[PDB]
Ligand binder design. Sequence first.
Ligand code: HV6
Ligand code: HV6
Ligand code: HV6
Ligand code: HV6
Ligand code: HV6
Lengths: 287, 287, 287, 287, 287
Amino acid sequence: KYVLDPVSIKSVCGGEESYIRCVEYGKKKAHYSNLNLLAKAILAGMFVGLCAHASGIAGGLFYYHKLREIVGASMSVFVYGFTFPIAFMCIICTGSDLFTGNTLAVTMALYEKKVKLLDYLRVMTISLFGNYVGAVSFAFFVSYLSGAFTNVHAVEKNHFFQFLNDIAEKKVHHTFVECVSLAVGCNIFVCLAVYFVLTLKDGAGYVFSVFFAVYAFAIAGYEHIIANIYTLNIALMVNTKITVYQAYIKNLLPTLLGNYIAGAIVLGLPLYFIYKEHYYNFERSKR
Amino acid sequence: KYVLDPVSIKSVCGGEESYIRCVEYGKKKAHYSNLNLLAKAILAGMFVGLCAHASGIAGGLFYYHKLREIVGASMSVFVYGFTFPIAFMCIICTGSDLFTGNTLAVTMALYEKKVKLLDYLRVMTISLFGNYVGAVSFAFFVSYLSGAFTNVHAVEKNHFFQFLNDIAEKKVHHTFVECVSLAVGCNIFVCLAVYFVLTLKDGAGYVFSVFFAVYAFAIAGYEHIIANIYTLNIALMVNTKITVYQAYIKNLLPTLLGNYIAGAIVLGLPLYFIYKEHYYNFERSKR
Amino acid sequence: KYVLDPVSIKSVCGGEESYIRCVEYGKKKAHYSNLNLLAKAILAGMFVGLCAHASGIAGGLFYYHKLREIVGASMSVFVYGFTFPIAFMCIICTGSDLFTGNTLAVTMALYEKKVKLLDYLRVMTISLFGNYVGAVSFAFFVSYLSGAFTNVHAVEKNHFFQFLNDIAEKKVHHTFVECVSLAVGCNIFVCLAVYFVLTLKDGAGYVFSVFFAVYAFAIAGYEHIIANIYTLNIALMVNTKITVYQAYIKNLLPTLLGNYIAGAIVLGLPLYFIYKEHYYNFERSKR
Amino acid sequence: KYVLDPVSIKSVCGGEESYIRCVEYGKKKAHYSNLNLLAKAILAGMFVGLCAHASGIAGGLFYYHKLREIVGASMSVFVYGFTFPIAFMCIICTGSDLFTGNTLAVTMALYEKKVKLLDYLRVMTISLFGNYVGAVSFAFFVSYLSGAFTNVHAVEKNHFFQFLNDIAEKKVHHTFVECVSLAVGCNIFVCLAVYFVLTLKDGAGYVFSVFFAVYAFAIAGYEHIIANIYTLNIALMVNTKITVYQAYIKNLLPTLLGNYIAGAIVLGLPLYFIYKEHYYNFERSKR
Amino acid sequence: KYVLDPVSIKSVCGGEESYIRCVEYGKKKAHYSNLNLLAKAILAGMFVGLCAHASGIAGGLFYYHKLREIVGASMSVFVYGFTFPIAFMCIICTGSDLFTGNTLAVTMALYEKKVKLLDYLRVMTISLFGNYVGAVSFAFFVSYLSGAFTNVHAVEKNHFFQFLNDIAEKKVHHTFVECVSLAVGCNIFVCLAVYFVLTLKDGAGYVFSVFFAVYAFAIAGYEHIIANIYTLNIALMVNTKITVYQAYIKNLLPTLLGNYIAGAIVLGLPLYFIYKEHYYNFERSKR
Ligand SMILES: COc1ccc(C(=O)/C=C(\O)C(F)(F)C(F)(F)F)c(O)c1
Ligand SMILES: COc1ccc(C(=O)/C=C(\O)C(F)(F)C(F)(F)F)c(O)c1
Ligand SMILES: COc1ccc(C(=O)/C=C(\O)C(F)(F)C(F)(F)F)c(O)c1
Ligand SMILES: COc1ccc(C(=O)/C=C(\O)C(F)(F)C(F)(F)F)c(O)c1
Ligand SMILES: COc1ccc(C(=O)/C=C(\O)C(F)(F)C(F)(F)F)c(O)c1
C-alpha cells in the first residue's frame, strides 16, 4: 500500500482567529488567584534574568579588547541578540506571564469588556511587581554571587565587566523622549512575538519567529523594562559607573511608559478597531 | 500499543491550488471598508519602518570605521538583510496589507473578473497612501525622536549616520532605467514570498521561505517602495546629503513604477494565462 | 480536558513511494500544451536569473579587495552558495519546470513507458529553450540594465565586476572532460533535491534539504547549465575577458552533456532497475 | 479536487498539560528495575562524554594561538556551545536518563505522592552513579586512548591540550558560592529543555529549543555535573595543571549541590504549587 | 467559523517504538536480492563521495594560505563539517544503505533472531563491497577527472590540494588504538543519527538532527570508513604524500574495526538488553 497524496494540514491561522486567541488568552489571566499570578510573574522575571546573564557572558566574550579595536561592539551585540531569545520559550513553556506581553493581551481583553478595570489593574500590578522581584533575585543570587561580572582591572581579562559597564552607560544617557521611543520600538516586537506564538502552532514557528523578533529588538538598541531591571541592577551591584538615580529615573520609568504605550495604544487600539466585529461574531455563535 | 506507521500528512500544495488561493486572497481585499483597509495599510507601513530601523542600527554597527577599512560594506549589508525579513511575519500575522504584495494578488483577482476596476483603483490607492503614512509616521515619531541616526561628527562614533548616509546616497544616484530595473527585481521576490506563504502552511515555511526571499532582495540592492519611503524620509530628517527632489523624483517614482510593473505584468499576466482554466474549473465545481 | 498522548503523524515516506511520486510527477509533464510548458520554462529561467543576480551581488560584496587579500575567494563563494538556493522554492511554488530536474523525472517516466519518445523529446526541448529564453531575458532586462556588474575600473569599487569576471574566467578554462565531470556532479545534487521535495512534505524539509543540496553544489564548483547560461551571458554583456566561443563551446555544451548524463543515466537507470517492480505493483493495484 | 482550507493542527500544548506530562514522565522512572535504570544511566553518561569530546576538539580548533591573540577565547567557546547540544537528542532518542533532568521530573513526581521516598533515593542514586561511570569510561576508553588531548608542547600544535587546560583551570578556581550559583544557572536551563521536549512534539521543536537552551548554558559558563565529570577526568588523565582534590572538592561537589538545588527547589516547588490542582483534576477524571 | 483549539498532533515517539522501528528496518534488509542490495550500496557510496568532494572543495576554499596563517585549519574543518551532512538525506531519500548504519540495525535484528547468521554475513559483505565500489568510482570518475584537487604548486592557488594532503596525512599517522577509538566515536554518532530519523518523522527532524550529528563527528576528527575510502583514494590518485600501505593498513582496517565495534557492541548490545521485552510484547500482540 503506497501513499501518493497525503492528508493536507495547516498549522497557521488568519488574523481574525489570531485576534480571538489573543483576547481569550488575555481574559484567562484575570481568573487566577493572586498567589498563582505572583508565582508565575516571579518565575518569568527569573527566566529573563537567566537568559540575560547568559547573553551578557556571550557578548562579553566577543568584547575582548584586541577584537574590540577592530570590530567595535558589533560582534558582542550580535552574539547577545543571538543568545537572548530563548527566554520567550522559557516563559511560554512553563505557562508564566511577563508584563510586556500582557500590555497587549490583557488590554485588548479589557477593550472587549472581558476584564473589569480593577481586575485589569491588579493583574498588571502583580505582573510588574513579580517580574521585578524575579529579575532582582536572579541578579543577586546567581549573577552577583557567581562573580562573573566583577571588575578585575586588567584589560585583557575585564571584557565581561567592560561590556556590562558600556551597555549600562549607553542605556542610561538617553533623554526622556529617546528612551520612550526606544521602549515603544521594543514592545511592538514583543507583542508581535506574542501574536506569532498565538498564530503559528508548531515548534519551528515558536522557536524561530520569536527568535527573529527578539533578536531584532535586541540588536536595534530597543529598551525592554524587565531586561533593563536585571541589567541595571546587576550593573549597580558590581559597581559600574552608573548611579541608582540614573538607572531608575533616566531609564526604567520612561522604559515602563514606552512599553505600556506600545502595548496598549499603538498596537491594541488599531487591532481592536479592526477585529472587534469578528470577536462579536465569535461570541454570538457560542450562544 | 506501539505506532510503527503514523498518518501521512503534507503541508504544501501545487501550483494550481496556490494560484486559486492567491486569487481568493486578492479578491477578499475589495470587500473591506475604506477605514478598515486604511488602518491595515497604516499598520503595515509602521511595521516596515520598525524593521527597517532595526536593520539600519544592526547594519550601522558593522559599519564601524576600522572594520569598514577591511571589509567595506559587506558585513553591514549582510546583517541588514539578515535582520530585515521579520517585517513579513509582522504584516501577515496581524492581517495587514502592503502595496507591493497587493500588486500581484489584487491584479490577478482583477484579471479573473473578481474585482471591478474602480474597486481595484481604490484598493491600490488606499493601500499605497496608508503604507506611506505609516512609514513616515514611524520615521518621525520613533526613528527621528530617538536620535539613533543623528550625525555626531566623530568618525569612531558616527557609523549609524554614515551607514544611513551612504545607503541613501547610493539609492539616489541611479538613472531612471536602472531604478526601474532594480524595483522590478525587488517586487518579483516580494510577490514570490507572498506565493510562498500561500503555498507552505507551517511556521517553518512561513519564517524561512520569506527569510531567504527578503534577505535575497535586500542584499541584492533591489528597490522596495515602502522601505525606500521610510529610509529616504529618515535620511531627509537627520540631514543626510540627499535632497527632497532627489529622494522623490530620482528614487521613489521609478521604484513605484518598477514595483507595479513586476507585480502586475511580469508575474501576474504569465501566471494568469497559465492557470486561468484551473480557476475556471474551481469556480464551476462550486455550482 | 488534558492531552497526554497526541496523534502520531509523519511527513516523510519511503524510497518506493518516492520513486512512484517521481514517475507520476514526470509523466504529468507530457500532458500540458506547448504554450503552457513554454511559459513555465520561461518563468523558471527568469527565477534562476533572479537568484543568480542576487547571489552575484552578495558574493561580490565579500570580494572587496582588502578582504580578498586575506581570505581569497572563500567568503564570496560561501555567501553566493548561501543566498542561491531560494530559486528552488521560487520554481516549485509557482509550478514551473527546469531542464535539470526534468532529466530525471521525465526520463524515468519514459523508462516506465508512461511517456512516448516524441513527447519526451518535445518536453525536454521546450523546457531547455524556455529556460534559455528566461535566463537571457533576465540577464538583459534586469541585470544589464541596472548597471550592477559594470566595470567601474577603481579597485576599491570594482568588486562586483571583478567577482563576475573571475567566476566567468574560472568556469571557461576547463577541458571537456573536466566540465562534463563537474556537470555530472551538479545534476546529481539537483535531482536529489527534486527527490527531497518529493519525499519530505513540510516547509522545513522543502526549505532546508534543497538549501543544503543547492549550497553544496554551488560551493563545490559544479556546473549548472541554466545558471551558466545566465552567468556567461551577463558576463558577455558587461565585457568580461571571456569570448562568445569560449562561453558556448568550452562551457555550455559540456555542461549540457554532463547534466543530461547525470540525470538520465547515472541516477535514472539504477533507480529504475531498483524500483520498477514497486511501480508495477502500484499500477496493478489501481485495476 | 483542490484543497483550499486544510485541517488545522497543533504540535504544542499548555503549561498544565506540560506539567502533567512532566509528572507522568517522572513517575515512570521508579518502575524500571535496577539494571535497566543502570544501563540507561551508563548510556547517557557515555553520550555526554561523546558530545563533550567533539566539543573539546571543535573548540580547540578555534583556540589556535594566532587566532587566540586576536579574539581570545570567544570563538572557541562559541563553537563548543554550537556543537554540544546534540547530546540531548542522543539521550532522548535512546530513552536514557541523566541526573540533571531527573532532579526536576522525579522530584515533582515525589511532590505529587507518585513516588515513595526510598524509590526516589534509589532512582537518583543509580542515575548519578551510572552517569558517572559512563562519563569516566568514555573519558578513558575513547578520549584518552585516542590521544586527541595530549600535550605536544609546541605552541602552534598544542591548542587542543591548551583549550582543555584553560577550561579545566577556569572551572576549578571558583569559590563554593560561585560554583553553586553557576550550577543553579545551568540546571535551570537543563530542566527547561526537558520542559521544551515535553511541550513541543516535533523534530524542529526537539532540535532547536534544546539547541538554544544547551548552547545558552554552555556559553554562559554555567556548571553541569556530568559534563564536568567528563571534562575534569580527561583533564586529570592528560596531566593538566589541576589536582584531583581541586577537581572533586572545588568543582564537582558544589556543582552537584547547585544542580540539585535548581532542579528540586528553584523550579520544582513553584511549578508544583502553581499546577498541583490541575494534576488533581487530571487524576480525578481518570476515575 | 473560527478555530481556537486545533487538533493536537505529535511527530515523535518513545524509545521502545524507536527500537522496534530499528529492528524492523534492520530485518527488512535481508529480504532484498543480491543485485538490489548491491545497487543500493553502490548508490550510497557514490553519494558519500559526492558530498565529500563538495566538502573538500568548501574546506579547501577556507584553507587559503593568508587565512591559514591566522586561523590555522579551524574554518576549513568547520565549513567541511557544515557542508558534509547532506549525504544522510541523499542516502535516506533514495532508500539506499550504508555499512555504518547497518552495523546497528541489522545486528540488532540478528540479536532478536529476525535475521539468520549467513543472511547477516551476506548483507554486511554486499553492503561494504558496494559502498567501496561506489566511493572509488566517484573518486575516479568525477573527482580525479575534474582536476579539482590537482597539485598546482603555487602557494596562493594550491589550497585545495594542500587541504586534501594535510587531511590525508593527519588521518594516516594514528596508531592502531587511536584509530580504533576515533572510529568508535564516529559510528556512535552515525547510529544515533539513524535512531534520529527513525524517531523524528518530519523534514525538520530529518534535516537538522542528522546535520548536528554528522557535523559533530566531522569536526571532532572521528573516522568514517566510507568517507575515508573516498578521501584516501582521491589522495592516492592526485599524488599526496601518503602511501597505499599507509592508507589501507594504518587507517582503513582499524576504522572498519572501530566502526563495527561501535555499531554492534557498544550500542547494539545495551539497547537490545534494555528493550528486548518491548519487542517481545510487540511481536506477541501481532498473534
Ligand atoms: C505566552 O507566553 C509568553 C511568552 C513570552 C512573553 C514575553 O513577554 C516575552 C518577552 O517580553 C521577551 F521576549 F522580550 C523576553 F522573553 F525576552 F523577555 C509573554 O508575555 C508571554
Ligand atoms: C499576506 O500578508 C502579507 C505579508 C507581507 C506582504 C508584503 O508585501 C511584504 C513585503 O513587501 C516585504 F517582505 F518586502 C516587507 F515585509 F519586507 F516589506 C504582503 O503584501 C502581504
Ligand atoms: C518540482 O519543482 C522543481 C523545483 C526545482 C527544480 C530544479 O531543477 C532546480 C534547480 O535545477 C536548482 F536547484 F539548481 C536551481 F533552482 F537552483 F536552479 C525542478 O526541476 C523542479
Ligand atoms: C527526556 O530525555 C532526556 C534528555 C536529556 C536529558 C538531560 O538531562 C540533558 C542534559 O542534562 C544536557 F542537555 F545538559 C546534556 F545533554 F547536554 F547533557 C534528560 O534528563 C532527559
Ligand atoms: C536510513 O537511511 C540511511 C541513511 C544514512 C545512513 C548512513 O549510514 C549515513 C552515514 O553513515 C553518514 F551520515 F555518516 C554519511 F551519510 F555522512 F555517510 C544509513 O546507514 C541509512
